Amino acid sequence: FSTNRIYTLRLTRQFQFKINKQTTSVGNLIFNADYITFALDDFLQAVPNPHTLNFEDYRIKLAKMEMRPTGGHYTVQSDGFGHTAVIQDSRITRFKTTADQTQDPLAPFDGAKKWFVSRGFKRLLRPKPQITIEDLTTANQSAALWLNSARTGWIPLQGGPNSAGTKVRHYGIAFSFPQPEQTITYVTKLTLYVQFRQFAPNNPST
Amino acid sequence: FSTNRIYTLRLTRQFQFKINKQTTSVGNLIFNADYITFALDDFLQAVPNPHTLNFEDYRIKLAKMEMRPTGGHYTVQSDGFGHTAVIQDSRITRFKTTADQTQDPLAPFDGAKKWFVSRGFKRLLRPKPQITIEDLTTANQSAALWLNSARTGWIPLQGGPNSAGTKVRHYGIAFSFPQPEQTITYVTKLTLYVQFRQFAPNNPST
Amino acid sequence: FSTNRIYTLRLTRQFQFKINKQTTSVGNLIFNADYITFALDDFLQAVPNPHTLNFEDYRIKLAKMEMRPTGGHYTVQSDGFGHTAVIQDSRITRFKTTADQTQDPLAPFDGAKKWFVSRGFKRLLRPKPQITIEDLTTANQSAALWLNSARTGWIPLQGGPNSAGTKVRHYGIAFSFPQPEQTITYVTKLTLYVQFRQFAPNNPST
Amino acid sequence: FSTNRIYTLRLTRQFQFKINKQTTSVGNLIFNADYITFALDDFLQAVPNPHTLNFEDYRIKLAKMEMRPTGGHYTVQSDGFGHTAVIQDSRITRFKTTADQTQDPLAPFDGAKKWFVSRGFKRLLRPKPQITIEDLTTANQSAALWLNSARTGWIPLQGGPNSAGTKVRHYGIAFSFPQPEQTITYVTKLTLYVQFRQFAPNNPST
Amino acid sequence: FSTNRIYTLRLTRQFQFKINKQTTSVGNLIFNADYITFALDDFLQAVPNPHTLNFEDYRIKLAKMEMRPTGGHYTVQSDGFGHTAVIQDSRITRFKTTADQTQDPLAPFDGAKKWFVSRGFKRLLRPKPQITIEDLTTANQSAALWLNSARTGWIPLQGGPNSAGTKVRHYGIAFSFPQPEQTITYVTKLTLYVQFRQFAPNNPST
């Protein structure tokens, strides 16, 4: 039971997602996209999970997204195919489309994988936290950097000036779809595979 | 034909299960759950099974639950996915939910396994009987303990002050589900793989 | 991440203990004794520890008691020697002496180990939970039984009719001492080495 | 004599520490704690050390804390035992207790190590600098990350907009103690084992 | 980084395709067909792709066509089978039928592979650019030749009197279908696997 003792937990949460009936540019093929990011706090605040953990540091080795249709949608009712893409930086926010796309906005990505709208998808990835760089050629601007291996660093749960280590946003997976003729509802399940370092007491009483 | 002669039987029973049309929080994703426990008497009292066995002891090596839809439900009509979980103590009783859950109540369990509402599931487990402990730090309260291996102990069919050995409750499997848009009926089949020890006569005449 | 996934934690708590100045049978050698038992709940209720754990079962592999003098007592100030003894059943309650003993009440025990009053002691043991036996030759009486190996069974945290699995009392260590000429205060630290089985969600919302 | 030429130095500083006579809840066992962090500037500003170094980068491979009693305190006068803990993030600041603790606030830590109040302690550690993350799920908040190996990065002594590279705070070691019956004064010695990269000139004249 | 440095990219674009409800020769089996050709410019003009590439030469090593039904068409709804055929010259233009065929117009082709109307198809091919021959036995007529291996030649992006290297038409894939009883809409995804030679600057400023 040393300072560097490691523990590994699996955490999950679920939510609903809707792809709306096509009501624009009717009769034509259009695409839209959304995305998901991963933060430990998102999973600890879920009702059935432990809301605090007695560990000093953590690191997300792996994340999983699984979206499957519900609401009585027929799997054999073909509604075309879109793509998933692993986007491991904050650029992913641009891929929640605010306007109809005339092409699949994620298909050109290296690593883009096809998925059929009526079946959903399942994909694993290594989501990345974003380290800060403030020394840019333009003043008063910052950029990001992320590490190739999760074993390189640790995120303290209560480190930093906000004690908000569990809220670090790890990027990230996006998914696109051709707009269907009828609304489709999905059940989404996210999973985190997290390593924790150093069992720790509660903060001292004040 | 010694005192420790062993016999093995397979026992089964069936019953109907209903997942009700969602009539609460319509438009939201909600989850509920139920559970099953195993007792030898539950199977011997089934109509087509032998209602009494001429053995002195028994032990349940393995149990099995299969739930498949009926009532004309389409397997290709997707209604999301829930989870099954092996819960081998009386805590399982809390997982027959009495209120709608905003998250899958069983997914966080180690060993939780996904299953699709429209296809049902099949799972095998080693259900455990609960040994009594009455020496707790709070007076007049009791707790439970179960044994890691079924080969460790035997249960007399007629042992104890009530001769109710066959009614020992073995835990246990729970299953959760997102509430669907229509009612779904299932056929559930349970199977016990039971070892019996010592062929025995009837009780003496009185 | 299976049903049988195991985790191991170290838990500790501390408290003060006093051996009072001898005020009886003055000038003569007398002995007294006290004892300690181990319950998981005792450690989870300690301020700096997690007060609930999200595991389904547990088992105490090892327990440790360490009592050391404080309050400015000189280690080189000899006050004789007493004994520690591992007593793994409820008989230990008789060894909190209510009357002065003319002999060391724990020395005859097999496994009794000497300890010097002015230095304290440190001892590891395997504490035992007490399984119930109610079939005795005398009516309306029960007795106990404990298992040789901790790997034999599991205690569900919320199992039993009281959901008080963490309050099972594990026996046990006692310690005796010759009554000193002046009061001595000690700091006692207990440690549990506990294996937990099956990461589990919170109980469903009601 | 290349750009990546490395030099290693040992640096030290000392200071006094006091554990105060217990004047609150007299008669009860209470605990308090304090902590130490490491910054190169803390050592260079010490009177007998070089106040500026002609190197471009540095990295702290190892740090060391030794606290031994003084003021005439007897080592054979027992005052119980507390614990030391390696806490490598800014959470350590909470472990300078501002209120009396009823339990040892550091004992539950993985890696916690006992130490006797009357003898002091000595412990080595790998203290960590905190890298900034500004992309959290809560807007305008930040968190930290540190690297598992000191060989992964270098800290420029004069890098950044403030040329304050030597002031990076490396975490960290905390120590707890039961409050004694009399005041105890200590001499604390800290030691840094620091690698430096690239012998460098003074800044150009202006 | 030599003149012959090669880069390889994957490029994709999508569009809609309709097979119209049969309104001619009703009650009888009829067939129609269409075709696709490949030009780098077709993919660079697509909205999400880079519209200019800074390379000197290119060559298409592989092309892919995937057409899948959408619009709510049931995959389990049989509508017969047609064929795909790789036609690597401009004769393919004749196989966009302008009159109903009483036989499958592509089935006789060597390499013809059947596909079911209700599931779509996926086929890979090596599309061919057409080299000009003007020396024919008939005056003022020209013919075509293509090379067996893609490694034999390179197409400069801006070569020729029109700088229209990216507009070379590569042949080619055709697909036939028996006319269904109801209209069927498809999503079509084309993919190019293109090797580029010699990273190049922009054209000089004028």
Numbering used by the authors:
A (entry chain B), B (entry chain E), C (entry chain B), D (entry chain E), E (entry chain D): 42 to 247
Paper text:
Five capsid proteins were present in the ASU, with the unit cell comprised of 480 Cap proteins arranged as eight icosahedral VLPs. The assembly buries a total surface area of 182,920 Å2 (compared with 13,650 Å2 in the 10-mer), with a notable shift in the ratio of intra- and inter-pentamer interactions, the majority now occurring between pentamers (68% involved in inter-pentamer interactions compared with 40% in the decamer). The interactions that occur within the pentamer are comparable to the 10 nm assembly, with each capsid burying 1,934 Å2, mediated through 22 HB and 4 SB (compared with 1,660 Å2 for the 10-mer assembly). Each pentamer interacts with five other pentamers, and every Cap molecule within a pentamer interacts with three other Cap molecules from other pentamers. Two sets of these interactions are identical and together bury 3,390 Å2 (through 52 HBs, 4 SBs), and the third interaction site buries 774 Å2 (mediated through eight HBs). The diameter of the VLP is 17 nm, corresponding to the size of the infectious particle, and exhibits a volume of 2,171,590 Å3. Differences in buried surface area between the two assemblies, 182,920 Å2 for the 60-mer, and 13,650 Å2 for the 10-mer, suggests that the 60-mer should be highly favoured; however, analysis by AFM and EM shows a higher proportion of the 10-mer complexes in the absence of ssDNA. We proposed that this is due to a destabilizing effect caused from the repulsion of the highly positively charged ARM domains present within the 60-mer when ssDNA is not packaged (overall charge of the virus interior is +1,960 in the absence of ssDNA). Analysis of the electrostatic charges on the interior and exterior surfaces of the particles revealed a highly positively charged interior surface, and a possible additional interface for DNA binding. These positively charged surfaces are distinct from the positively charged ARM domains, and mediated through dense clusters of internalized Lys and Arg residues (R46, R51, R100, K102, K105, R109, K154, K155, R160, K163, R164, R167, K169, K230).
Here, we present three high-resolution X-ray crystallographic structures for distinct macromolecular assemblies of the capsid (Cap) protein from the beak and feather disease virus (BFDV), a circovirus infecting critically endangered parrots. These complexes include a 10 nm assembly, resolved at 2.0 Å and comprised of two face-to-face pentamers of the Cap molecules, and two 17 nm assemblies comprised of 60 Cap monomers in the absence and presence of ssDNA, determined to 2.5 and 2.3 Å resolution respectively in the same space group, arranged as 12 pentamers. Each Cap monomer was comprised of a canonical viral jelly roll built of two, four-stranded antiparallel β-sheets, with sheet one comprised of β-strands B, I, D, G, and the other sheet comprised of β-strands C, H, E, F.
